[PDB]
């Protein structure tokens, strides 16, 4: 409820500050989310790494390269995993 939202705000400030610190904070926010057993729209579900459990934004804990071919593609590397993720896009 409110508890997640406070953690989310805290996770956001740490997030640019240090990906690694944020990684610890997010893992707390996600752990809270399952424990509270509350589903939220896109806020945590769509804004995190698959195994880091860290806030996903390009430029901050993770970086994205945008490629132009006539197939759109972006590649995202998130530091906490240290791994590159592909996200296909069309139009």
Binding residues vs Zn ion (CB under 5 A): 49, 52, 78, 80-81
8 A C-beta contact, residue 59 and residue 88: no
* 61 annotated to a ligand binding site: no
* 44 annotated to a ligand binding site: no
Considering the complex, state which of residue 73 and residue 77 has its C-beta at the smaller distance from Zn ion: 77
Task: State the minimum distance, in angstroms, from the CB of residue 20 to Zn ion.
Answer: 11
8 A C-beta contact, residue 38 and residue 1: yes
Considering the complex, state which of residue 3 and residue 45 has its C-beta at the smaller distance from Zn ion: 45
8 A C-beta contact, residue 13 and residue 55: no
* 8 annotated to a ligand binding site: no
Task: State the minimum distance, in angstroms, from the CB of residue 18 to Zn ion.
Answer: 14
8 A C-beta contact, residue 85 and residue 44: no
* 49 annotated to a ligand binding site: yes
Please state, in angstroms and rounded to a whole number, the distance separating the CA atoms of residues 45 and 49: 9
Which residues fall in the annotated binding site for Zn(2+)? Answer: 49, 52, 78, 81
């Amino acid at each position: 409820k409110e508890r997640i939202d406070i953690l989310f705000s805290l996770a956001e400030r740490v997030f640019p500050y240090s990906p690694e610190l944020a990684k610890r904070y997010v893992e707390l926010a996600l752990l809270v989310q399952q424990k509270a057993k509350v589903k939220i729209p896109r806020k945590w579900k769509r804004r995190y790494c698959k195994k880091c459990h860290a806030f996903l934004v390009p430029g901050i804990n993770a970086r994205v390269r945008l490629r132009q071919k006539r197939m759109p593609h972006i590649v995202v590397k998130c530091l906490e995993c240290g791994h590159i993720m592909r996200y296909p896009y069309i139009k």
